[PDB]
């Protein structure tokens, strides 16, 4: 909500990560009881570039 935290920078390459971050966002907005709330991205600890390298390691490991 306050702009771009510079930690959540998905590269122009590997833009498939957005479609998984949608599910990871919409998980907790449905698990929490009560009103489904508008949910905003806050932090990716290892960086957005190094986040999807873990997914690519899982894809090589199958």
């Amino acid at each position: 909500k306050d702009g771009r935290h510079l930690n959540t920078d998905i590269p122009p390459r590997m833009g498939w990560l957005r479609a998984i971050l949608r599910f990871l966002g919409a998980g907790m907005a449905m698990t929490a009881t009560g009103v489904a709330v508008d949910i905003y991205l806050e932090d990716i600890h290892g960086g957005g570039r190094s986040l999807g390298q873990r997914f690519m390691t899982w894809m090589r490991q199958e």
């Binding site: 510079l6 290892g46 960086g47 570039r49 190094s50």
Partner: peptide
């Protein structure tokens, strides 16, 4: 101390390896 101890992800590795490498400058 833990608040300030967490202080571009590739430039951080570049500056860490920049700092960690050097030290110096019979009759």
């Amino acid at each position: 101390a833990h608040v300030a101890s967490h202080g571009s992800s590739e430039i951080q590795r570049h500056i860490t390896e920049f700092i960690s490498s050097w030290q110096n400058h019979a009759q």
